[PDB]
Amino acid sequence: GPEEITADIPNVGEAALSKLDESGIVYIGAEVTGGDILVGKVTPKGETQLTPEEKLLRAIFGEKASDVKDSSLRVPNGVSGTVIDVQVFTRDGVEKDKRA
């Protein structure tokens, strides 16, 4: 499967996405620190094969064709700033989310 640009991801904290909106991308104007999350991004993990203990998880959660890790964009360690401008470019065919 592809990657998820939505905020819906695990291993987070109120400090993990308290500045993000409901669709992963940081606000325009949110004054961030060094090491926060700007874009939340989750990617796929292992495929292998359907295990005996995960046979019920093969198809029982809509988008259960992919796994979930963590590869969100972060401010590189050291720099502050204020997000002034956000661009979102979409390859044609892909579903535009609510912020695009």
Binding site: G29, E31, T82
Partner: protein
């Protein structure tokens, strides 16, 4: 002065429709504001101005103890018939030089 909240402004690097200075230049001109307070720790001043021309420092709705000492101080220039700024200014006591990076 410590904090400014212009109404239609998200971050300090934006621009407001109808004022010929940036929001950053408005922050510098408010940083140079010479104001006396009398019986408080901090205080919140309110500014409302609409119409073609300057927004001087005498257009601030003064409280019962805040006293502006130089009312001819220009902040910005409004430049249209219906284009108005409306901000809240936070003025407090202190000692020395307390920058933004130490201390929203």
């Amino acid at each position: 002065v410590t904090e400014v909240e212009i109404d239609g402004v998200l971050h300090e690097y934006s621009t407001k429709e109808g004022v010929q200075e940036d929001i950053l230049e408005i922050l510098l001109n408010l940083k140079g504001l010479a104001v006396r307070v009398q019986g408080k720790d901090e205080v919140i001043l309110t500014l409302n101005k609409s119409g073609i021309g300057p927004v001087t420092a005498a257009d601030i709705t003064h409280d019962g103890d805040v006293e502006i000492v130089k009312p001819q101080h220009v902040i910005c220039h409004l430049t249209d018939e219906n284009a108005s700024i409306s901000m809240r200014i936070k003025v407090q006591r202190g000692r020395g030089y307390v920058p933004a990076s130490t201390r929203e």
